[PDB]
Design a protein around this ligand. Structure first.
Ligand SMILES: [Cl-]
Ligand SMILES: [Cl-]
Length: 162
C-alpha cells in the first residue's frame, strides 16, 4: 500500500465532472476544479488543466496524470511549509502518507491550522494526537475517511486500508 493506492481508495475515480462532499466541481481522483457554482467555469478549468476541449469528460490516463501532479504538489507544499515540514521529517513512512492525505484533501493552509495535533504527532503521542484530530469539522463532515487517516496516524500501519 502506498500514498497513491491510499488516496485512490479515499477519493475514488470519476471520469465525468462531479460534485465533491462540499458541493464543489471535481473530476478524476479528487482533483478540485473550482469552488465556483458555475459548471461552465468548471469545464473551462478542466480544459485548461487537460490541454484539450474535453466537454467535461476525461480518460483514465488523463485522470491519473492529474493525480500524479496533485500528489507531487501535496508533497512539495509540505516540504515548503515551515509548519508542516518539521512534522513530516519527524514521521515514519506510513504516517507521512497520512499527512500527505490530509494536505491533499484540505490544502496546506488548512492542515497547518491543526496546531495542537501537529505538535502531538511530532512528539510521537499517537493516542493523544488521534483524540485531538477528531475534534474537528474535518472529522465530523467526513468521518469514515477521517477515521482511516487517524487510525493510520495512531498505529503506523495500513490496517485501516486493508
Ligand atoms: Cl492543474
Ligand atoms: Cl467519509
Amino acid at each position: 500500500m502506498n500514498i497513491f493506492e491510499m488516496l485512490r481508495i479515499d477519493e475514488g475515480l470519476r471520469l465525468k465532472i462531479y460534485k465533491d462532499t462540499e458541493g464543489y466541481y471535481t473530476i478524476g481522483i479528487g482533483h478540485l476544479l473550482t469552488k465556483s457554482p458555475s459548471l461552465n467555469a468548471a469545464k473551462s478549468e478542466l480544459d485548461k488543466a487537460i490541454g484539450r476541449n474535453t466537454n467535461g469528460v476525461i480518460t483514465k490516463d488523463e485522470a491519473e496524470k492529474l493525480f500524479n501532479q496533485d500528489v507531487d504538489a501535496a508533497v512539495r507544499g509540505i516540504l515548503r511549509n515551515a509548519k508542516l515540514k518539521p512534522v513530516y521529517d519527524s514521521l515514519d513512512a506510513v504516517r507521512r502518507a497520512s499527512l500527505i492525505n490530509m494536505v491533499f484533501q484540505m490544502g496546506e493552509t488548512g492542515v497547518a491550522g491543526f496546531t495542537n495535533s501537529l505538535r502531538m504527532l511530532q512528539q510521537k503521542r499517537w493516542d493523544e494526537a488521534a483524540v485531538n484530530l477528531a475534534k474537528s469539522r474535518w472529522y465530523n463532515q467526513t468521518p469514515n475517511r477521517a477515521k482511516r487517516v487517524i487510525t493510520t496516524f495512531r498505529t503506523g500501519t495500513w490496517d485501516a486500508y486493508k
